[PDB]
Amino acid sequence: KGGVWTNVEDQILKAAVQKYGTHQWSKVASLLQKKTARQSELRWNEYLNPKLNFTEFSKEEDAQLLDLARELPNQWRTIADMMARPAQVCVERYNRLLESEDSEDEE
Amino acid sequence: SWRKGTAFGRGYINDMTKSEYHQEFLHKHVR
């Protein structure tokens, strides 16, 4: 029942945030059917927002990462701030990184 | 001898939120 995100709905959400601002999410789920506020706001902060950093990882990004993940035991909200990245991107990059060591109409 | 065996042990800012009285207040009424 809980839905994934079509590009339709996603676009409507972006235009909505453009009109209504961030804080009025319950007005965003008015436009967007089949979804809730918490879902909307949740996605906008986690994924859709353009200010987020989705980019490749430099050789320094990885060093700094491994450094932190060793320094701070599992806290991926804090670390994410330290890296200025969304968290599950950071965890994704991290797990893939240790694996370097290896051996319509209604819409 | 009982005392030894234990592990351990042997100003005006101008602002409303960062004052001491305030942290007393919220430290109490919020439980």
Next chain:
Amino acid sequence: GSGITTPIETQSRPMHNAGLGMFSNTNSSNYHSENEDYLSSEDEVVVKFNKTSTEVLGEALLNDSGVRTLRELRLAGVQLPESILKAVPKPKKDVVVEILQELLGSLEAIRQRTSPLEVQVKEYYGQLSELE
């Protein structure tokens, strides 16, 4: 394209049949194994005394390795039989065997009857240095 699709489907059906078939075979094998074990046990059941006891112990061990209630009952029956028919070292050995059997695992009842006989003996005891 149509021909290829048709060919694939039959193969998938065959694979499903194979998946069913292997399992069935395994089951059959298991069944066979069970029957063999039962037969062996029956045959076994069907100094000399000591030897017999040893054999019994071995059988018990085997059973354990390989229902529990049934086994216990059998044990009890055996004990009863022994009693009807009716040294220290032998006793010790028996005890050891019993212990072994318990670890591997009616039994409670059996324990209680023997324990009860021991209790009667103690009560008889109950009923200075020498005594001590």
Next chain:
Amino acid sequence: AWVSAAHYNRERIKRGAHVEKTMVKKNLGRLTRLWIKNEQERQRQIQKNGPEITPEEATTIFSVMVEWLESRSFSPIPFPPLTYKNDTKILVLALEDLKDVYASKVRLNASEREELALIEEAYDNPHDTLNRIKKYLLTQRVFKPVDITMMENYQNISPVYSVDPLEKITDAYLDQYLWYEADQRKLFPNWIKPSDSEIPPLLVYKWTQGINNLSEIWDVSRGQSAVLLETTLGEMAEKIDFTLLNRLLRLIVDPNIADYITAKNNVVINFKDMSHVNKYGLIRGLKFASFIFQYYGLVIDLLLLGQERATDLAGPANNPNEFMQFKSKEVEKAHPIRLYTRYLDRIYMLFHFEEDEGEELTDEYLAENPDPNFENSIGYNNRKCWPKDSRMRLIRQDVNLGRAVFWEIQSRVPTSLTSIKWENAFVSVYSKNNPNLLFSMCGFEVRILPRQRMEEVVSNDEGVWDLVDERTKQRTAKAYLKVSEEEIKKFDSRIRGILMASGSTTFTKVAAKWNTSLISLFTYFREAIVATEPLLDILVKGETRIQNRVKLGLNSKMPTRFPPAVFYTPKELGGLGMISASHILIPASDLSWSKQTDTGITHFRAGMTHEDEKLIPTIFRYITTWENEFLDSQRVWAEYATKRQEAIQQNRRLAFEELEGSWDRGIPRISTLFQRDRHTLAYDRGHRIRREFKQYSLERNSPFWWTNSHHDGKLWNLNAYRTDVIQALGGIETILEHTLFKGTGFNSWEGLFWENRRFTLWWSPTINRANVYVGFLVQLDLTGIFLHGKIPTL
């Protein structure tokens, strides 16, 4: 200006004087904003500043815990391998416990609708849901944000955390598992007790009995002195740090679950606009925040008591002691600390001091604290609920002992872990000069007088315990009980709740709410309430005010129109059904009742009988006191032990003749043995702390937080009251003389099922009556009915 208005209005509400309906709401809003600002400030300053504890102190701490966990030969809790024997059961428990929040709801929200829906699928496929659950335990270290809505108590404002359901399920299961395995491997020693086996007043009683039964304390023989310590640990969950938590959980648990728990606490917190990552402290709303919190508490207590004495209290790992036990009386006397218990934050320590040791402590304390003016007793606090005579007296030996003890224990704990202030603390000194020994646990305030120095032994009311010695069997002390001031104010505040909220919620709804607070208040304190005026008073206004609430519901304040029949009729009667504590005159003029038989018309009046007048009976007599129930519990459980041995030894099954008499007796309430679900319940352990932490994770309270009817059966029966109320006014035949029951034409009561207007009809021939003091007679339009004044619905 805004902040200052928030403070001012709050301290105006604490006194509880004419605050508007909205100002309470608004003020709550301003306080939650301010509180979150303080939180984010603390977290940022921790980033800039760095963690408070220091590496030294941390190393010492970790070392302490390791030394303990070896001393107890403890096995780190494994991860719950699949094919675990109890998996499906622990599932059933957790899922039920989430289900119950929904179950008592008339109407359900969509999010709630989702929460109830997810569980139901859950029942269908446990094995899969286990796969998903444990997969989360491994994979997922990043979680969804958490919402905060501060709920108001009308004095305190307390937080409430709300998590998302998927996370709630894994949190619940993991919680339940940790408590089961933990109690199974005997992690927590005896003296950490907001625990399972004992309800809090039973805890207090066992604490007193514990005090008396142990040797010598009441001996005034030479230099004997006593002190009582009640210390809140202060901020505790707010000072916990994760770098440490991960490691101290590594000791006790597999690194998987430890890392999980540690990560779960770092989550974005959202209230409206405000949002901040939680970088530092504990979030008390997580289902397993209980276990974490207690474990950490133990870590503090090992600092307080030291390794040795702690091993004394908890005894050997082979045979751990009970709550109050020891091996030898030597081990008791070998150390100054005799009783130590920590109930969540609160710490209670009992210190008995010989002249030598006591004078040594005050020597060192005074040695670093010169006090020439003897003014230590000015800032000294003590109980103001008890009267002056029986309060603690202020004398130099006493006071100086108190501040000495508090000084040393003050020192032991580092200011980084917790904060222990002299302000919050209470020290009670039992002295040759002080006959009383004061303390308070939960809401009970307890004055312990040893029968020795009472100078007189008087048979006293049921709000007073008798302390019975384990060996002598003589009664050596009376414990006087009163109701802590705080929970009096909580009661009063709740009544005010019903008042402010029930603007037009109907009489019936109000009555249930009024009863629940009352039943809860008496039952928890049953005995104590008798001795307190303000709880004792307050109520008289509270009922007379609500009655005066219904009286305005038509138009009147007038006595004459309404006879206590309206309010107190049981529901079957169609009376509101409200219970009573107060004084109320059933005027003998209103008992008159007339019936017709084909022979004639007969009348009945008991008014002419002049004796003690008829009064609506009240609770204080009706509710059973504590001491009788504990005694009955002891004898009953003894009897059940025996009969059970009869069934076993004779291989029979229990007759039931014995059982029936004691079936409702006993504090665990024998009936509980035979309930539908024991098979599951034995795998439910840590229920009591879960109940208490239901404060934080959900908005609507559960007014009875001290029992599970599952484990403890059902403690109190009130039906008797209902018959007494019926006969108190005359009885069923009499009661219905007040109603319309004869108008409906039904001949006998028994066949009436029932199903505001309906109310006023049912009682109409009273509410409308010709003995009204003032009113204006108006004949109805086409009928012969006369109306006195104007009654709206009639």
Next chain:
Amino acid sequence: MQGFQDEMLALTDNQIAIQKDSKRKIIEKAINEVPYRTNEEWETQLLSKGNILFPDDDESGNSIERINEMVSKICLQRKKVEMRLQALEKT
């Protein structure tokens, strides 16, 4: 306060006779329903807080039982497998 509600107090007469009777019956069944020696865990810990030739015959039958089931399993599964194989070959 849903959990702790007092139940259905009876005024009328017989129901008091009826309610008591019902209670008694319930009690009986609870004790009566429960099987002896079934428990242990609830009674113990709950108790704790409060207080302060035949064999041979059986074995033979089981073996026999086992034998029937294995043969049954063999009879039908094998046939099904054979049929499937034949169909595949034809296709």
Next chain:
Amino acid sequence: LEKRLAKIQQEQEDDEELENLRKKNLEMSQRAEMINRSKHAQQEKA
């Protein structure tokens, strides 16, 4: 009994996966250690 067998197969699959995941965490810790140890070695060399 075929359906019952299949359910056992499913039970076997999940447990193995769980074991692998647990192995995965310990393995990840070890890998981090190799980097942690390597970094320490680099510091020693410096």
